[model samples]
Target: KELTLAQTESLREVCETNMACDEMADAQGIVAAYQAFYGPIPF
Candidate 1:
């Protein structure tokens, strides 16, 4: 369940872009994106 290089860079780009305008908001968005990409947290 480790991230591949492309996946890692994709998420890193999220950090670099910082899309949500707020740090915590950006992190939350990333978490949701991560879940969507990875098929969500169990339970």
Candidate 2:
């Protein structure tokens, strides 16, 4: 499923917020979810 920009942004926010709380696993899960659907991150 192709994610909209808003969806991607939301996922990024989740990743960032969790990472800030030292929830690396959650953060990575969010990132991996995006990558699984969209391929490697641009940055």
Candidate 3:
């Protein structure tokens, strides 16, 4: 579970560094956006 947090954080940082990210809106927005394209974030 904790590793998942680390994984998500690392991926988020990598994404923000390489891509155009908005203020992110909110948690549901984040989930929806990722789910739309990424299928799943590997839990």
Candidate 4:
């Protein structure tokens, strides 16, 4: 699904917050960071 600009920003915010909290240190964080950089799920 194509996210709206607002949705993208929201996702970015979520990513940044989690990253700051070291939420990306775990499996979920890894996945989230990947999605944040590369966009949404591929399949």
Candidate 5:
């Protein structure tokens, strides 16, 4: 569980970098971070 948490943080860190691009990319970051924590979201 701890390892998964770290993975989420890592994704968030990268996402933060993308946030510099545009506000829309920030939404992607949230989705990416969510997936990192809870596997993947079903379509």
Candidate 6:
């Protein structure tokens, strides 16, 4: 319950940066992060 409210920020000076890249690679990276922290990422 408490953990769900972290990224729900109402407002602030939002400094952000992003780049155009291969989305497939990005998806793989997200899966890797999830697996590394949690458990096996089933294909």
Clashes of each: 0, 0, 0, 1, 0, 0
- TM-score-better candidate, 5 vs 6: 5
Best by TM-score: 2
The list of candidate 4 runs beyond 4 A from truth reads 20-43
Residues 1-43 of candidate 5 have per-residue lDDT tens digits of 2346666565556556654433444565555554655456443
Name the TM-score of candidate 1: 0.40
Q: Over the full model, what C-alpha lDDT does candidate 4 score relative to the true structure? A: 0.56
lDDT of 4 by residue, 1-43 (tens): 5667776566556566655424653555544665756566454
Q: Return the candidate ranking by lDDT, descending.
A: 2, 4, 1, 5, 3, 6
TM-score of each: 0.40, 0.43, 0.35, 0.41, 0.39, 0.29
Q: Model 3 off-target regions past 4 Å?
A: 1-3, 21-43
lDDT of 2 at 26: 54
Tell me the lDDT of candidate 1: 0.53
Query: Each model's C-alpha lDDT?
Result: 0.53, 0.59, 0.49, 0.56, 0.52, 0.30
The top-ranked prediction according to lDDT is 2
Give me candidate 3's TM-score against the actual structure.
0.35
Candidate 5 is scored at a TM of: 0.39
Q: Can you write out model 3's per-residue Cα lDDT over 1-43, one digit (the tens) per residue?
A: 3446676575566445433332341444544444454566676
For residue 11, give model 4's deviation from the true position in Å. Answer: 0.8
* Clash pairs (backbone) in predicted model 5: none
Tens digit per residue, CA lDDT, model 6, 1-43: 1322323221111111112212322555433334344455333
